[PDB]
CSV table of N, CA and C and ligand atoms in Angstrom, one decimal:
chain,number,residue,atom,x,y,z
P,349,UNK,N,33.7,141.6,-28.8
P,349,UNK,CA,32.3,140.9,-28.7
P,349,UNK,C,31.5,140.9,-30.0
P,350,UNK,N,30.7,140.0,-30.0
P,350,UNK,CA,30.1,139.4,-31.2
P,350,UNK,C,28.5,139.9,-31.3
P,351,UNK,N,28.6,140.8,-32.6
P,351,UNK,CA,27.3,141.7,-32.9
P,351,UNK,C,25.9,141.1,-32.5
P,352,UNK,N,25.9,139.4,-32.9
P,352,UNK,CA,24.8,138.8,-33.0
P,352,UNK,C,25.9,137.3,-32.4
P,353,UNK,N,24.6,136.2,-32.9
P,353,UNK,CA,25.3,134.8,-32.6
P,353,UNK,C,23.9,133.5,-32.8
P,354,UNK,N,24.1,132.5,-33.4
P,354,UNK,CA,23.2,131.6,-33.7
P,354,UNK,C,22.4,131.3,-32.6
P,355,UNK,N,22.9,131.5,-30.9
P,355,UNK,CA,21.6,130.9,-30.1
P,355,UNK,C,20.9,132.3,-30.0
P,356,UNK,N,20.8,133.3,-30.2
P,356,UNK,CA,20.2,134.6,-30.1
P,356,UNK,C,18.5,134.1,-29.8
P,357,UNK,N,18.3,132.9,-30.4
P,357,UNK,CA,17.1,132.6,-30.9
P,357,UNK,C,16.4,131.2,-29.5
P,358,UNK,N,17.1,131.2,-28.5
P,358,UNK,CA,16.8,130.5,-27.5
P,358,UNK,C,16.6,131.1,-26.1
P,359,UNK,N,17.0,132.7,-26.1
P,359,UNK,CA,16.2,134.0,-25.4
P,359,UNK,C,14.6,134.0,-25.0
P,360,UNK,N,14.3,133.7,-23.7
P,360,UNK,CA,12.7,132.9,-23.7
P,360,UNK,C,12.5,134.1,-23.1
P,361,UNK,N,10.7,134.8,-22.8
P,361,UNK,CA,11.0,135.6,-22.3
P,361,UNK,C,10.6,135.9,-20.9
P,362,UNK,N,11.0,137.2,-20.5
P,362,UNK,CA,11.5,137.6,-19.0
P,362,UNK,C,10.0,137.3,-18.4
P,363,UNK,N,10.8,136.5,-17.3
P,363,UNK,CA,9.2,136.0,-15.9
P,363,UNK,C,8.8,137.6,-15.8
P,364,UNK,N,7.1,137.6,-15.4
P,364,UNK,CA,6.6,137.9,-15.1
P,364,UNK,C,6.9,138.6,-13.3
P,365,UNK,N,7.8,137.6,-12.8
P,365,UNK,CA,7.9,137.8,-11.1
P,365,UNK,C,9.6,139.1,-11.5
P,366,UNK,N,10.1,138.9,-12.4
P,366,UNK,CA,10.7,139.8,-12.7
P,366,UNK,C,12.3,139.2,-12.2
P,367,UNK,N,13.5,139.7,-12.1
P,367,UNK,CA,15.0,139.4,-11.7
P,367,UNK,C,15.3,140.0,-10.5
P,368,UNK,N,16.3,139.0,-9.6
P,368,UNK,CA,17.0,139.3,-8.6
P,368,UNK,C,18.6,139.3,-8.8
P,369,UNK,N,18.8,140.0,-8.7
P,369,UNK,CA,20.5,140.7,-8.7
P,369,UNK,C,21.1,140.0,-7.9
P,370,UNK,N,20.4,139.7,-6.6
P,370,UNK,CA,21.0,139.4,-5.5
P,370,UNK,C,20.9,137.7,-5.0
P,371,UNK,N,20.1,137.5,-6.0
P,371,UNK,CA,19.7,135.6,-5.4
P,371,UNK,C,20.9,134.4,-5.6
P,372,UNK,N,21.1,133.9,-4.7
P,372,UNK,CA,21.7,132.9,-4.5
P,372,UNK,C,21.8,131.8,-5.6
P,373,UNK,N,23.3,131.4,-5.6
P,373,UNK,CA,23.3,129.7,-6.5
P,373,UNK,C,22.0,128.9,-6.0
P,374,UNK,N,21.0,128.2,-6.7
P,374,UNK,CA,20.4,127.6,-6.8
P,374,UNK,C,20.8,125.9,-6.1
P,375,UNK,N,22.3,125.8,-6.3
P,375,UNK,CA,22.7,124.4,-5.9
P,375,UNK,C,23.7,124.9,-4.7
P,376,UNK,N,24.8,125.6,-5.0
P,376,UNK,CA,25.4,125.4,-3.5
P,376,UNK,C,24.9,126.8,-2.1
P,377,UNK,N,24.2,128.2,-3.2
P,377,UNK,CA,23.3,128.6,-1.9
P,377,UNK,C,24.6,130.2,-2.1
P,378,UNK,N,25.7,129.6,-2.5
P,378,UNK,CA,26.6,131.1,-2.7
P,378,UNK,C,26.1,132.5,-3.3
P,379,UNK,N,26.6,133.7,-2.6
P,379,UNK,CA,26.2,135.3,-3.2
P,379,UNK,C,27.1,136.1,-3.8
P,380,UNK,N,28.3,134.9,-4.3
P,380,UNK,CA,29.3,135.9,-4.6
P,380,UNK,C,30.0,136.0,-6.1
P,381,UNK,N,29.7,135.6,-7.1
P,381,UNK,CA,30.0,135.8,-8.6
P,381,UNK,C,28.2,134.7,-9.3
P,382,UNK,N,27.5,135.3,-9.4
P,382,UNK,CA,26.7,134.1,-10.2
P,382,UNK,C,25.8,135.1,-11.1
P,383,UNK,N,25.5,134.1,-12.3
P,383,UNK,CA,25.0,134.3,-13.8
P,383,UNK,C,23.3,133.8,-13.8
P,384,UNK,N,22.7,134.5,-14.9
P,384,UNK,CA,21.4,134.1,-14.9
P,384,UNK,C,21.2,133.4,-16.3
P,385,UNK,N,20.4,132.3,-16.2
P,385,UNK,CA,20.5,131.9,-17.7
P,385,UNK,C,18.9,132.4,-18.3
P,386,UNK,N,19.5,132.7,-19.4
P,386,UNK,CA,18.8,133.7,-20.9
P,386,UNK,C,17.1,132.5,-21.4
P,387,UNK,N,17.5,131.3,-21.3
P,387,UNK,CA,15.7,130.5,-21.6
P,387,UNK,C,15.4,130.0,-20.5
P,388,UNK,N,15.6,129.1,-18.9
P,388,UNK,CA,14.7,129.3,-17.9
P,388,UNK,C,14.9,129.9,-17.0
P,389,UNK,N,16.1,130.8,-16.7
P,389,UNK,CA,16.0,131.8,-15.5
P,389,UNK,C,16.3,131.4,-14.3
P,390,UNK,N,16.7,130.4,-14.5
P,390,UNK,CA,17.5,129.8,-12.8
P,390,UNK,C,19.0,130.5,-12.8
P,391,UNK,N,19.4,130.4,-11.5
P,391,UNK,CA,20.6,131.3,-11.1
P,391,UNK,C,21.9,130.0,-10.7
P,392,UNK,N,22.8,130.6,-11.1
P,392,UNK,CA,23.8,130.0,-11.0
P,392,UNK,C,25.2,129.8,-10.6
P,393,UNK,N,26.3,129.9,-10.1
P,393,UNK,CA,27.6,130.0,-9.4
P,393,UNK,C,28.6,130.0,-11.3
P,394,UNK,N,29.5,130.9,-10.8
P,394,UNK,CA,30.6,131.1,-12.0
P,394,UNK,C,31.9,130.1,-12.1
P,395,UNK,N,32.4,130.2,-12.8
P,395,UNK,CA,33.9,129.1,-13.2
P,395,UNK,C,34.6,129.5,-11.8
P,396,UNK,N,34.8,130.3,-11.3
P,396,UNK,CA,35.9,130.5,-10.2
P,396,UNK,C,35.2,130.2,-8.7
P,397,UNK,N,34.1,130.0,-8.8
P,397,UNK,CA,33.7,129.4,-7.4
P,397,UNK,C,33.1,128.3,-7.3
P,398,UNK,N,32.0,127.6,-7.6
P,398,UNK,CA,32.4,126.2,-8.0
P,398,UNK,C,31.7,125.4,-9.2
P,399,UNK,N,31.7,126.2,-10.2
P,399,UNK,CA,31.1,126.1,-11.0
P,399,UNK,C,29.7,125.3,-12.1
P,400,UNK,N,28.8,125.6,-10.9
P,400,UNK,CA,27.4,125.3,-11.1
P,400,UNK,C,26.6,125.7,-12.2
P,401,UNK,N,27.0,127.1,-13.0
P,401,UNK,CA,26.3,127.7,-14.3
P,401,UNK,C,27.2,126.8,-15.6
P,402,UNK,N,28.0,126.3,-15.3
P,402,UNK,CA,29.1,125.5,-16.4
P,402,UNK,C,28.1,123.6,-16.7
P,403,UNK,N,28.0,123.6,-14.9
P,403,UNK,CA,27.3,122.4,-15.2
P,403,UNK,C,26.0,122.1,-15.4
P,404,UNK,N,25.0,123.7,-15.1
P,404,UNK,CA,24.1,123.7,-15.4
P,404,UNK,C,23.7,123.7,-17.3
P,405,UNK,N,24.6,124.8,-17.7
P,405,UNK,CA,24.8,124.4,-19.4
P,405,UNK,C,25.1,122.8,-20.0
P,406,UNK,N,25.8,122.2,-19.1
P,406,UNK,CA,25.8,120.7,-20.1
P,406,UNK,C,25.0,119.8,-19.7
P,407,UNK,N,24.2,120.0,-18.5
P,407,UNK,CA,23.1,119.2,-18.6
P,407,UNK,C,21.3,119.4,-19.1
P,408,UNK,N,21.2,120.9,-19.9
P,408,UNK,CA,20.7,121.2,-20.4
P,408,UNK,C,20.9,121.8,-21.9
P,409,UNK,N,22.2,122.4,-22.3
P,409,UNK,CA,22.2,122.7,-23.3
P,409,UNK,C,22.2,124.5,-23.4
P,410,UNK,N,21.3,124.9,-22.6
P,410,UNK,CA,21.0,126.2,-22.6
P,410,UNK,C,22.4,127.2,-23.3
P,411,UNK,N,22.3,128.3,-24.3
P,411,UNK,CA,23.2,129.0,-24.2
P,411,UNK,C,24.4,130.1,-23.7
P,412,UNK,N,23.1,130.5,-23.5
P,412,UNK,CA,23.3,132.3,-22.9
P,412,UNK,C,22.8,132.5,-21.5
P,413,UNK,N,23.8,133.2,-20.9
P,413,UNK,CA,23.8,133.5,-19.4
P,413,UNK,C,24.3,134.7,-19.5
P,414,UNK,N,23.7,135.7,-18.5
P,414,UNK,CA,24.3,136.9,-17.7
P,414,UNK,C,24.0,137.5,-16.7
P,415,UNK,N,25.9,137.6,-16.6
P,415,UNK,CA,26.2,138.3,-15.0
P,415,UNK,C,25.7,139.2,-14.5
P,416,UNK,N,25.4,138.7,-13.3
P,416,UNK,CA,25.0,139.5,-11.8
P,416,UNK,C,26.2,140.4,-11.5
P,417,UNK,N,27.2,140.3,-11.9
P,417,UNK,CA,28.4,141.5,-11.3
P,417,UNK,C,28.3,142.6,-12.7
P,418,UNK,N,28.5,142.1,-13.9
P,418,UNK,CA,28.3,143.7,-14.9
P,418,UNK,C,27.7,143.3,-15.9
P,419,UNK,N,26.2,142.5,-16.0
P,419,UNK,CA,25.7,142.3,-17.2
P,419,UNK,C,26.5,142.1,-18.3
P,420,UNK,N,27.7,141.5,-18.3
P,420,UNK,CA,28.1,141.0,-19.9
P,420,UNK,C,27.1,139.9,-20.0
P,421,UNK,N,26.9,139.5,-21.4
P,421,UNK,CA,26.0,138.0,-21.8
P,421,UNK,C,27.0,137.5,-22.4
P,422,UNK,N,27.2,135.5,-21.9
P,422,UNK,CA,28.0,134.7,-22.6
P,422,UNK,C,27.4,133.7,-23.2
P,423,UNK,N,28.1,133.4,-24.3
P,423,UNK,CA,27.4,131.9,-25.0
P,423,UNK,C,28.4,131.1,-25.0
P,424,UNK,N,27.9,129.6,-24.3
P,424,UNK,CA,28.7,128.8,-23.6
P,424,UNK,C,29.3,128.0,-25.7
P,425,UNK,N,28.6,128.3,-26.1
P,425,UNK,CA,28.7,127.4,-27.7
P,425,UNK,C,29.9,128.2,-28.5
P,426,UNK,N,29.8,129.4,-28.8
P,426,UNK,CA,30.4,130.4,-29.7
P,426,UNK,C,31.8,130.7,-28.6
P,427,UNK,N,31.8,130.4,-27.5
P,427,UNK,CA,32.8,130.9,-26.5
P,427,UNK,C,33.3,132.7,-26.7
P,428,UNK,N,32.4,133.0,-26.6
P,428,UNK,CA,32.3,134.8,-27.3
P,428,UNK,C,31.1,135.6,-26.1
P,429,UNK,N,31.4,137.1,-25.9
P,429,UNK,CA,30.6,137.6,-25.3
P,429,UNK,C,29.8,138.1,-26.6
P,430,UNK,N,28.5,138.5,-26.2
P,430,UNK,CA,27.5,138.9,-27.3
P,430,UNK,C,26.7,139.8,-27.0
P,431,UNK,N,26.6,140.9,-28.1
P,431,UNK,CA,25.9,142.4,-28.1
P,431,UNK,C,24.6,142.1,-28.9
P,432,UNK,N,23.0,142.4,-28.8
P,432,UNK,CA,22.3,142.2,-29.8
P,432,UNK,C,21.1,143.4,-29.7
P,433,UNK,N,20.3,143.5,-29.9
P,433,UNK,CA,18.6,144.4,-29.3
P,433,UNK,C,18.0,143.7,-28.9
P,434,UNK,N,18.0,142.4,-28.6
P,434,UNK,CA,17.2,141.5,-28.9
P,434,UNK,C,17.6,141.0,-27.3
P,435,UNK,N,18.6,141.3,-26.4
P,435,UNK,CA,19.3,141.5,-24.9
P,435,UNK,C,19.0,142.7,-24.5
P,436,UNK,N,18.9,143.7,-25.1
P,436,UNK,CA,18.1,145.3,-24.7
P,436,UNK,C,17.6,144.9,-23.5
P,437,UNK,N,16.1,144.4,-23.4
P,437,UNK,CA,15.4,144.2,-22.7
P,437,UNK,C,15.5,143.9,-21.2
P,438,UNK,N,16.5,142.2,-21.5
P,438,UNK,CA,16.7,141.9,-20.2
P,438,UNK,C,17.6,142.5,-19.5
P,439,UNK,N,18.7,143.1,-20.4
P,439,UNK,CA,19.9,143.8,-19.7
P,439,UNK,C,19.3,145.7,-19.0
P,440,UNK,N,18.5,146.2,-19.4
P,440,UNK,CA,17.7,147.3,-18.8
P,440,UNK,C,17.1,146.7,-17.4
P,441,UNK,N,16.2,145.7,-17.5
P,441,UNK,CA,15.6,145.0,-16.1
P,441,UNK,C,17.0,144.8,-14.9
P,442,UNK,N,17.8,143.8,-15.5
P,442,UNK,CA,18.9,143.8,-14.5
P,442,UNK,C,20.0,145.0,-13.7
P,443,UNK,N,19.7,145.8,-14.9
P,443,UNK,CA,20.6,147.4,-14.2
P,443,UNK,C,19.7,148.0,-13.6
P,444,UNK,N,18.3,147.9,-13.5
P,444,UNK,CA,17.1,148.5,-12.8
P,444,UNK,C,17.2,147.9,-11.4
P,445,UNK,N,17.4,146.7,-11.2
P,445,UNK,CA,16.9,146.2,-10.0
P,445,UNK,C,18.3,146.1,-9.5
P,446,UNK,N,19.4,146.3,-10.3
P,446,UNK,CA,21.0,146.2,-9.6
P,446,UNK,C,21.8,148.1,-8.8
P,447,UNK,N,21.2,148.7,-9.8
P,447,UNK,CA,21.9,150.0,-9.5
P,447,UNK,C,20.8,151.0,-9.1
U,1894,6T4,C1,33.8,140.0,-17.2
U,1894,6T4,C2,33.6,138.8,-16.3
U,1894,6T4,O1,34.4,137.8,-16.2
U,1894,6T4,N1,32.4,138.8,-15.6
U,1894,6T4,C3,32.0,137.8,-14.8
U,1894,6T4,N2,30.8,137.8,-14.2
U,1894,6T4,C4,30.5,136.7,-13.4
U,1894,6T4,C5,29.2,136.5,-12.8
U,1894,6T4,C6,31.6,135.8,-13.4
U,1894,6T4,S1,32.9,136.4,-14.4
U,1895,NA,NA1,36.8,128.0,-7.1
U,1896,ZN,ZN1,27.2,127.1,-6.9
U,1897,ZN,ZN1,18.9,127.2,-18.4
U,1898,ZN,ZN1,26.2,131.4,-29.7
């Protein structure tokens, strides 16, 4: 995994209403692999079920998402998982409200 990475810098920050671990794809309504994206925070379904966070990235651009199953963060650009301090934040919130 990659120390840092050019969208680092499109990380908006965390709602006020705070994260759900457990909320549903936004488009088909599924609870069983989905990602959160890192600038508006809508929820999303993964590549193996029917891949709504994939299509949600090419019709906005957005970079960085992470998983609801083990907080890794992906950038859909660099095709790389990504470590930073600058993810500190929201990856602490999501282990709070998950474990
Ligand atoms: C390591 C890995 O592949 N983690 C994944 N998390 C989701 C939500 C889909 S795939
Ligand atoms: Na599938
Ligand atoms: Zn979906
Ligand atoms: Zn987004
Ligand atoms: Zn990147």
């Amino acid at each position: 995994p990659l120390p840092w990475c050019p969208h680092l810098v499109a990380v908006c920050p965390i709602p006020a209403a705070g994260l759900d671990v457990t909320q549903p794809c936004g488009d088909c309504g599924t609870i069983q692999e989905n990602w959160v994206c890192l600038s508006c925070y809508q929820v999303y379904c993964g590549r193996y079920i029917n891949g709504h966070m994939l299509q949600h990235h090419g019709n906005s651009g957005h970079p960085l998402v992470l998983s609801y199953i083990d907080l890794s963060a992906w950038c859909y650009y660099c095709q790389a998982y990504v470590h930073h301090q600058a993810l500190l934040d929201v990856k602490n919130i999501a282990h709070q409200n998950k474990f």
